[PDB]
Design a protein around this ligand. Structure first.
Ligand SMILES: *[C@@H]1O[C@H](CO)[C@@H](O)[C@H](O)[C@H]1NC(C)=O
Ligand SMILES: *[C@@H]1O[C@H](CO)[C@@H](O)[C@H](O)[C@H]1NC(C)=O
Lengths: 48, 21
């Protein structure tokens, strides 16, 4: 895992590019990743 | 016998987090 640096990140098939930062969002056990108003990924949980 | 379902039969459509949307 890398943080605070642009990367080609992949999470269980969800692919994207950019920086990661500590999340203030409170997910629920069934929830895996988070989307925003514009239907784009905004927060993701480490599967490990 | 029969009855009325007011607001039952609702579930999370997918394993996706959202907020105030
Ligand atoms: C995966 O294994 C690591 C290595 O000890 C452990 O720290 C982590 O909690 C494990 N995660 C799961 C979901 O089993
Ligand atoms: C439900 O449908 C059945 C069959 O038409 C009917 O006998 C019954 O009165 C209905 N009940 C309600 C609450 O609509």
């Amino acid at each position: 895992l890398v943080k605070n640096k642009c990367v080609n990140f992949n999470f269980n098939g969800l692919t994207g590019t950019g920086v990661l930062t500590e999340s203030n969002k409170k997910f629920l056990p069934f929830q895996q990743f988070g989307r925003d108003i514009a239907d784009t990924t905004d927060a993701v949980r480490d599967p490990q | 016998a029969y009855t009325n379902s007011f607001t039952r039969g609702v579930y999370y459509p997918d394993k996706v987090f959202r907020s105030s949307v």
